[PDB]
Structures are given as C-alpha cells and as structure tokens.
C-alpha cells in the first residue's frame, strides 16, 4: 500500500494505490483505499484491511451521531475518534490511518495515526509499505500553498515512484479532492503515471 | 530452513500372477494442489524382465531407478552377461536403499517380474530397504483405498461358501492376466474418484516369459 494526504491553497487531496495482496498474490487490483467518514472528512487506510474497515465504519457511525446532535464535526474531532479506537485497542489492531478533511474555518488539514495510535497534524503525510521509497522525493518536492494542479502532479509523481519500487503497491492511482467547491474523485491509469 | 524432500503424489500397484506380473502406476505428477504433468511415467523397464517403480519424492525415485538400471548394466559386465534374477535384483535394491539409511530415498519401491521357476513375483521395499516378496502391493497416496479391495477380490478374504454359514472359505482360484488388469483398472478408477492426487492416466507394464508389454488407460483429469 502507498497512501498520502497533501494540504494545498484550496483544501487537501488524498492519494492511494489500488492494490491489496495476500503474500505475493494480488487479491484485489482495483481496491478503493480512500474512505469517506463524513461529507468532507476522508481517510487513507493501511494495515489490516479488516481492522481499517472496522475502524472507519465505527468512526462514520460516531460522526453521523455527532452531526445529528452538534452539527458538522471538525477534522480534528474525526482524527480524535480514530485515535481513541487505535490507541485503546493498540494490542489487537494493525492500522495506519491518515485523516484528511476540509473545514471553511480551518481549510485543508491532515492528521496521521501510526501503529501506536499517536496523532500528528502535518502539512502532508505519507504512509503504507511503499511510502519508505518516497520520503526523500516528497521532502524535496513538497511546498505549502500549492495549486490544485501542482498538488495532483506532486501526489501522482510521488505514488508513481512508491508503486514502481514497492511490490505491495500498484494498479490505479485514486485521488479525492476536498475543497469548498465540493468532493472530486480522480483516477490515473498505469499507462499515464508509469511514463512520468 | 531448506527441506530436501517433497511429495509428487502418485499411486502404484504390483500384482503377481501364476506365470505373469503387472506393475501399474498413474501418470499424474503433483506438488501440493498443482498438477506438474498429466503424463510423467513412473513405472520403468530396467532390463532382464524386471519392471520397477519408486513412488513418493520423484527426484529420489528417478535417482534410485537410474542407479538400479546402472547396477543391471554393471552386473552384465562383471558376471559374463548373466541375467539378474528378481530375487538378486531385490537384494541389490535393499543395499542401494540401506546405503542412504541416515539420509533416505523418500520412496516406496515395488519391482515385478518372474522368479527362476517362471512364476510371477512382486517385491515391496520400505524407504530404508526392508523388503518382502508379496502377491499384492499398492504403494503411494491411495494405497489404503486399494489394498482392502485387493484383499477382498484377489485373496477372497471375509468371503465364504454360500449355505456353509462361514464354515467353508471361498476357494482361491488362479487369476488370468485379463482378470488382474480389470482389478487394476477398477482399483485406479475408484482411487481417482476419492483421491485428489490420483488421475489423468494409468500405465500398466505386464511381464511374461515373452517379455515386457505396455497398456495405457485414461483416468478422470479433475
């Protein structure tokens, strides 16, 4: 798995590869790893698929009940619910989740939750097995307040390298754009991102 | 760690008639749940009217058969082209097997032929060279499915004369080559139904005073 979330001028973009493996066998080559827990709060999932699906489902439930009573939750609140589940059940969970959301007040925010269930607010976050290979590239190429087009290019180039070197990553590059304008889904096929 | 052994599946059957012997094997070669080949011969003419099969780990089987064939070649060279009798072959194969007693050939070996009185002979070996002369021996995956059937239909075990209420055993009759081949074919047909490693094809080598001849029959490929 290769997943990232990047904040830019107009919001945040979530990027992920589409590959799920059992050992060397590709169980799913068109996996959707960008998962909606609220209208403009999405997460990137890495680790146990059962664990990250179970956690995301519980979070979606928590934010739906939150919205009923208190109105639209903050990205920070969504991250906090993710952290609570991950931290308290650290002994029985294998989950690395990036939480990305758009508020109008706060704009684009990214929170990463590693295995221990710690929370880190970052301008951008990379995670998954393929992320190891792009720490150099991402640290050299990331700028704050990039345009939508620059941020799509940054994620496309980044995950392109992650996929190239990681056997566990591959397939299509899925992206979700979170802005005031709404929610936009992007897909990029091998013939496009391999020649970069 | 490295495991020097594997299981290539397969089942072999040796039956000794009055004046003939048959050594039959399926032609399927497998590892785990995959088919390697649907036709990889397992029963070989070794010369001197001796047929051999070493079933189990195919590599060890090929090695043993190869060594025994070579043993026959050198027996001729060393003993003025004397024919190697089935009993002498059997003792020779024991020494081949027992030579690797502390790193064994992972195979169940059966040889078929005629003894020095022209009567049908089958010899059965354990992996380390323990051997016995037998009238009936199935080896390999489906051996437990075949041997009870042969006990019943060859030796007429647990069969008695109707109207004697178990006081008179069904009398043993000499089986013809044609009846033995029916029992071989039915054994493998039954084994193919119930054992996932058995199928594809059945190759039978028949041994008589006239020499070695070969019969092949298709088995279900699932």
């Amino acid at each position: 798995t290769s997943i990232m979330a990047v904040t830019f001028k107009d919001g945040v973009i979530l990027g992920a590869d589409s590959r799920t493996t059992t050992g060397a066998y590709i169980a799913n080559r068109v996996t959707d790893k960008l998962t909606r827990v609220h209208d403009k709060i999405w997460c990137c999932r890495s680790g146990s698929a059962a664990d990250t699906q179970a956690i995301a489902d519980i979070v979606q439930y928590h934010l739906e009940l939150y919205t009923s009573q208190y109105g639209t939750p903050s990205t920070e609140t969504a991250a906090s619910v993710f952290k609570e589940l991950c931290y308290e059940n650290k002994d029985n969970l294998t989950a690395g989740i990036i939480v990305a959301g758009y508020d109008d007040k706060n704009k684009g925010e990214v929170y990463t939750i590693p295995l221990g269930g710690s929370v880190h607010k970052l301008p951008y976050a990379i995670a998954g097995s393929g992320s190891t290979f792009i720490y150099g590239y991402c640290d050299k190429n990331f700028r704050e307040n990039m345009s939508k087009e620059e941020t799509v290019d940054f994620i496309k180039h980044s995950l392109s390298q992650a996929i190239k070197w990681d056997g566990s990553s591959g397939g299509v590059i899925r992206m979700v754009v979170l802005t005031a304008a709404g929610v936009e889904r992007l897909i990029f096929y091998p013939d496009e991102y391999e020649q970069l | 760690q490295f495991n020097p052994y594997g299981d290539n599946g397969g089942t072999i059957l040796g039956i000794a008639g009055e004046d003939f012997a048959v050594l039959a094997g399926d032609t399927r070669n497998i590892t785990d749940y995959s088919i390697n080949s649907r036709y990889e011969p397992k029963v070989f003419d070794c010369g001197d009217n001796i047929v051999m099969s070493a079933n189990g780990f195919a590599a060890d089987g090929d090695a043993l058969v190869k060594r025994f064939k070579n043993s026959v070649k050198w027996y001729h060279f060393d003993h003025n082209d004397k024919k190697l009798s089935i009993n002498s072959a059997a003792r020779n194969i024991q020494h081949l097997l027992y030579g690797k007693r502390f790193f064994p050939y992972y195979v169940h070996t059966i040889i078929a032929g005629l003894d020095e009185d022209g009567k049908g002979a089958v010899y059965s070996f354990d992996p380390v060279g323990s051997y016995e002369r037998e009238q009936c021996r199935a080896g390999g995956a489906a051996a437990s499915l075949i041997m009870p059937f042969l006990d019943n239909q060859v030796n007429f075990k647990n069969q008695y004369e109707p109207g004697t209420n178990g006081k008179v055993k069904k009398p043993l009759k000499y089986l013809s080559v044609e009846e033995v081949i029916k029992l071989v074919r039915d054994s493998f047909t039954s084994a193919t139904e119930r054992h996932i490693q058995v199928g594809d094809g059945l190759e039978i080598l028949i041994v008589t005073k006239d020499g070695v001849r070969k019969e092949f029959y298709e088995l279900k490929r699932d």
Partner: protein, 219 residues
C-alpha cells in the same frame, strides 16, 4: 514413520528340546496395517535364527550381514560359530552406530554342543543379554513369557510349540499392532526346523473351541 518398525510379538524360549521361536506377521505404519504376511524371524543361517523387533530394515540388513560374518568365521576357523560369538558380532556392530538412530531389539537363537540351546537379546542401545526366555509385546521387552512365567523346562517339543503359538495368539488378540499369522520355529543342535504359518483368524476360533478360553468373545 517412513521406516517400517515392529514393536510387537516376537517370542523365544529355551526348553529341554532346544529353543522355540514364535512371531506374529503384522506390519503397521501408524494405524494403517501395511501387511499381514511379514517374516519377523530372520534365518541368519541353518543353525542361527534372529527375531525382528524395531526397524524392519535395520533387523533384516544387519542380521543378513551377521550370516555373512558367521560364514567367513566358519571358512577361517573350520568350526561352527558359537551363539555367544555370533551375538557379539551384531552387538559390537550396533554399538559403533549408537546415537545415529538404529532401532533393533532382537533375540539371536542357536543350539551348539559347546553352549547348548542359547538365546541372546541384542539391543540398538548396545545391550547383550543371555536368557532362558524373551518376549516383545507393543514396544516392550520381557523375560517372563506372556502367559504363566513358570511354564516347563521338561516340556514336549509338540507342547512347547503350542505354548509359543498360544502365547502369540494371546498378544495378537489384545495388541492392535499384533496379528496376521503365527510363524513357528524349533531350534535343535543339528539346525532349526520351520513349524509352519498359522492364520490368527482361524487359530483364534479353533483355540477358543478346543481350550474353552476367550469366553468373553462371542463366536
């Protein structure tokens, strides 16, 4: 296991008329009955008998070898090898291999005029023991004779044969891994005499009817 092993039904006893040797003929790999017709008595030579318990191959190979070494001794010394000497060739051989995983519990039986009727129990551990009676029932070796420990020194050859046959039947019934047939041998000074193959199925019903024993079993 891959290697055929025999933990049960080998009996050898000394009496007035020489030695009686009685074995079952069953080979088991786990709970699978591999054969009902194996020979557990190895004919080393016309005067020396060996019982197969432990590794079937280990017993066959090294007791066939012992017959070869016995034959060489007779060519070189122009004299029959003593049971003491023949047993010690095999015992000294397995002791060299000790710790390598040889499995053997064997009774070497011979009748020479120097020694008289002699039984040596030879172990893969390197144990060599002279005794009047040895038995192996489900991986356990005993010096008492399966049924009544006393039996008789002054016992007819016919009666001694029956006791050995009846002793294997007792074990064959109770022990799962013992069965098939009984093989009988009578060892004299002039050599051993085969006393035939008796199916335990047919033997059991006949013995029960004639002795009146096995009342518990319905037939």
């Amino acid at each position: 296991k891959i290697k055929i092993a025999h933990g049960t039904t080998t009996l050898a006893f000394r009496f007035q008329g020489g030695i009686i040797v009685a074995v079952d003929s069953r080979a088991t790999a786990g709970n699978w009955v591999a054969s009902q017709t194996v020979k557990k008595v190895i004919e080393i030579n016309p005067f020396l008998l060996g019982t197969m318990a432990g590794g079937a191959a280990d017993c066959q190979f090294w007791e066939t070898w012992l017959g070869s070494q016995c034959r060489l001794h007779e060519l070189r010394e122009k004299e029959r090898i003593s049971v003491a000497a023949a047993s010690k060739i095999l015992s000294n051989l397995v002791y060299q291999y000790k710790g390598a995983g040889l499995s053997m519990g064997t009774m070497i039986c011979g009748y020479t005029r120097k020694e008289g009727p002699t039984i040596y129990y030879v172990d893969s551990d390197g144990t060599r023991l002279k005794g009047d009676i040895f038995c192996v029932v489900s991986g356990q070796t005993f010096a008492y004779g399966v049924l009544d420990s006393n039996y008789k020194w002054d016992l007819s050859v016919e009666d001694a044969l029956y006791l050995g046959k009846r002793s294997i039947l007792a074990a064959a019934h109770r022990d799962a891994y013992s069965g098939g047939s009984v093989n009988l041998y009578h060892v004299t000074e002039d050599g051993w005499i085969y006393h035939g193959n008796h199916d335990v199925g047919e033997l059991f019903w006949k013995v029960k009817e004639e002795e009146g024993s096995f009342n518990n079993v319905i037939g």
